[PDB]
Amino acid sequence: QVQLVQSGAEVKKPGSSVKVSCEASGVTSSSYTISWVRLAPGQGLEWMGRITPIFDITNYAQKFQGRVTLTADKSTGTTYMELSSLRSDDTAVYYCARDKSDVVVVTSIRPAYYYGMDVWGQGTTVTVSSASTKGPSVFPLAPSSKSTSGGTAALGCLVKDYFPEPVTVSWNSGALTSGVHTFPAVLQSSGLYSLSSVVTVPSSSLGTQTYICNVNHKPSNTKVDKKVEPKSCDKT
Amino acid sequence: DIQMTQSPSTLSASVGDRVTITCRASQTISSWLAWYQQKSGTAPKLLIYKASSIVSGVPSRFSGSGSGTEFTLTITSLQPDDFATYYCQQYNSSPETFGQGTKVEIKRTVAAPSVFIFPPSDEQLKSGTASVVCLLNNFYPREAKVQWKVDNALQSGNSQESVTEQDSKDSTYSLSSTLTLSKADYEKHKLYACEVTHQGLSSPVTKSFNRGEC
Numbered sequence: 001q002v003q004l005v006q007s008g009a010e011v012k013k014p015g016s017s018v019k020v021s022c023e024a025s026g027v028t029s030s031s032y033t034i035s036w037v038r039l040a041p042g043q044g045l046e047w048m049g050r051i052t053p054i055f056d057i058t059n060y061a062q063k064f065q066g067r068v069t070l071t072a073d074k075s076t077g078t079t080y081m082e083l084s085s086l087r088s089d090d091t092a093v094y095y096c097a098r099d100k101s102d103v104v105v106v107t108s109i110r111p112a113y114y115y116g117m118d119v120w121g122q123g124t125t126v127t128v129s130s131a132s133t134k135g136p137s138v139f140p141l142a143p144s145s146k147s148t149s150g151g152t153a154a155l156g157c158l159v160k161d162y163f164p165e166p167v168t169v170s171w172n173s174g175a176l177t178s179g180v181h182t183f184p185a186v187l188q189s190s191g192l193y194s195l196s197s198v199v200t201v202p203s204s205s206l207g208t209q210t211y212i213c214n215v216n217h218k219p220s221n222t223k224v225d226k227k228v229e230p231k232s233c234d235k236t
Numbered sequence: 237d238i239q240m241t242q243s244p245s246t247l248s249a250s251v252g253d254r255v256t257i258t259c260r261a262s263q264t265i266s267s268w269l270a271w272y273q274q275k276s277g278t279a280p281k282l283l284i285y286k287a288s289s290i291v292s293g294v295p296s297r298f299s300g301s302g303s304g305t306e307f308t309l310t311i312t313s314l315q316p317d318d319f320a321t322y323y324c325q326q327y328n329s330s331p332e333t334f335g336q337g338t339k340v341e342i343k344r345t346v347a348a349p350s351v352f353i354f355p356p357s358d359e360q361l362k363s364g365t366a367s368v369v370c371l372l373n374n375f376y377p378r379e380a381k382v383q384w385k386v387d388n389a390l391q392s393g394n395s396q397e398s399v400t401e402q403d404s405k406d407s408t409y410s411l412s413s414t415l416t417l418s419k420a421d422y423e424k425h426k427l428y429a430c431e432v433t434h435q436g437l438s439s440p441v442t443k444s445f446n447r448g449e450c
Contacts, residue, residue, distance in 0.1 A: 035332075037280075045272070045280065045323050045334035061331045095279050108330045111268040116327075118291070120279035139357040141369055146445045147352040154352040154371055158360075181373070183398040183412040195398070196412045198371055231355070234449040 002027050004034075004096050006121035011164045012086055012128050019082040020124045022096035027077075030054045033099040035117055036070065036081045040092035051079055052105055059107065083126075091128045096121040127164045131191035135222030136162035138215050141198065142231035143206050153206055155228050156198035157213035161190065167217040169197040176211075206230045238262050238326050242335040248343040248377075253314045257322055257338045259307040265328035271300060271309050272323040274337075276401070280323065284309065319402075341378075344407040348436035349375035353443040355428070355450040366422040368415040370430035370443065374408040380434050382413040385444075387427030391415060422447070 007021040022034065033052045040046055049060040053072030060068050067084040083090055099105055100115035141147075141156035148154075159167055169182050182197040197213055211228045239262045249255050259269065271284035282291055284300040287307055297318075299310045311318055319342055324335040349372040356366040372380055378399065384391040397413040413430070417423075429444035 039274075044336045045274075045325075047325075047332040047334070059330060063331075097279075109327045109332070111266070111327055114268070114285065114327055116270040116282040116285040116291075116325075117272075117280075118282045120281075123279055137360070137363070139360045139367070141354040141371075142357070144355075144450070146443060146450065147354060147371075149350045149352070152350075154350075154373065156354070156369075156371075158357070158367060158369065160360075160367070181400050181403075181410045183400055183410070186396050186398045186414075188396065194396075194414070196369060196371075196414070198373075198410075198412070200373065231450065233355070234446050 002098060002119050004098065004119055004121040006094070006096055006124045009125040010127070011133075012126060014086055014088055014128055014130055016086050017082055017084045018086065018126050019080050020094055020126070022079050022081070022121050024077040024079075024098075027098070030074070031104040033101065033105040034070075034079045035097045035099050036068075037095045037097060037117070038092045039095065039123070040089070048081070048083075050099065050105070053079060054104070055106065057106055086128045088128050088130075091126065093123045093125050095123050129163065129191050131163045133220040134161065134163045134192065135217045135220050136160055136167060136194075136215065136224075138213065138224050138226045140226055140228045141196065142228060143201075143203075144231045144233040145235060146233050148203055151202055151204075152200050153203040154198060154200050155206075155211060156196055157215065157226060157228065158194070158196055159185075159215055160194045161188070161192040162194075162217055162220075163192050164219060165193055167193075167195065167215060169195075169216075170214045171197070171199055172210075172212050173214055237331070238265065238329060238333050240324055240326055240333050240335040242322075242324055242338050244338060245336060246339045246341065248341045249314060250343045251314050251316060255311040255314055255340065257309045257324075259302065259309070259324040259335060261305045261307075261326055261328075264304045265326045267303050268326060268328040269300075269302065269307050270325045270327060272325060272334075273318075273320050274323065275320045283322075341402055342407045344376050346436040347374065347376045347408050349373060349380060349411070349432065349434055349441075351430070351432050351441050351443050353428070353430045353445060355445055355447075356422070361419050364419045366417050366419050368417075368428055368430075370413045370415075370432070372411040372413075372432060374403070374406065374410060375434060375436065376408050377435055378402075378409045380411055380432065382411065383431045383433075384413070384415045385429040385431060386425050388429065
């Protein structure tokens with residue numbers, strides 16, 4: 001029942017350093033090895049490096065070398081990954097993993113005794129933007145003639161210009177969940193995020209039922225509920 | 237240095253089906269290959285090592301094969317929870333290199349989207365900026381072209397979009413395209429359209445509104 005517990009998510013200005021932790025417990029050796037792998041948006045999975053704490057032996061990837069630094073604290077079964085000259089494309093999710101070997105890894109993986117990276121951390125999300133923290137302006141997507149289809153109306157919320165992710169949206173304090181779609185945020189050229197949350201209801205309910213989006217941006221630090229009400233549009 | 241290319245980059249399939257992902261290594265790696273499954277909010281899962289050796293806890297339906305530079309991962313009978321991305325990893329030489337991942341999506345019927353358009357809010361308009369949201373609801377395949385026109389005059393470069401993940405109940409997608417102008421340029425025209433083409437569309441569906449009636 002070996003498990004790896006990484007540190008919380010992290011938002012860093014470009015150029016800054018980030019150091020995420022990882023706490024093994026419980027491996028069956030002091031001579032375990034820990035790899036670090038990042039999930040990077042658009043380029044896939046990606047091996048960075050590797051540390052065997054007992055001997056403090058480290059092997060980094062060429063593409064990183066200059067910026068990565070693996071370290072350990074043998075007393076507390078924790079390793080640390082420090083990426084340094086942070087560019088905007090280091091924005092990614094950072095995993096630590098066990099290298100399962102029958103033999104202590106002291107340089108390369110010795111392939112005949114390898115069993116894969118068999119246990120991973122939860123991940124740590126690291127966002128790299130010049131941007132500064134900010135809550136969103138929530139605007140209504142009003143139901144109307146132009147948001148209708150054969151008995152059905154669509155309405156919603158525009159969660160606009162925040163940083164960093166994440167924001168959450170429920171509808172009518174979570175009472176209304178069937179038919180809801182909340183789209184992946186999107187990164188504007190301003191460096192600020194913007195999503196839309198949307199519902200389909202039957203049109204005849206716009207008059208009797210009241211609809212509200214609940215927007216929680218936990219970073220900074222808005223809680224806002226907007227009442228979405230029907231708007232008038234050209235019949236033709 | 238070794239580069240791993242898998243195929244296909246993506247593939248749609250059904251529960252029950254026989255799925256096989258392929259892996260080519262840029263130089264021989266003997267049998268030193270592992271397969272990883274990854275879903276959304278979760279870390280990769282190890283499935284296979286030494287090309288064919290199955291992990292303690294991985295279902296019998298998963299099988300690996302290959303040696304040298306051609307390898308194969310095979311789900312025999314697909315399954316509700318096998319919809320994910322699969323990565324192969326080479327652990328011959330260092331560095332460890334992964335494949336680019338193969339996303340395996342569900343296969344449902346063709347479904348035409350239902351289109352909606354949304355005029356700027358009264359209160360966004362107080363701010364100098366005006367956003368127009370076109371919504372494409374519940375469709376398949378994931379491919380859709382969204383085109384803004386003002387008035388009948390094609391925009392380009394003001395319109396970010398976003399797609400929902402393949403819905404859990406009906407396996408359809410949803411899209412949210414978003415035109416963004418200034419309360420000045422807006423405000424210069426009357427006719428905001430939003431034309432949509434899909435595979436399940438006879439003819440390009442358009443939703444449009446007259447400004448200042450909305």
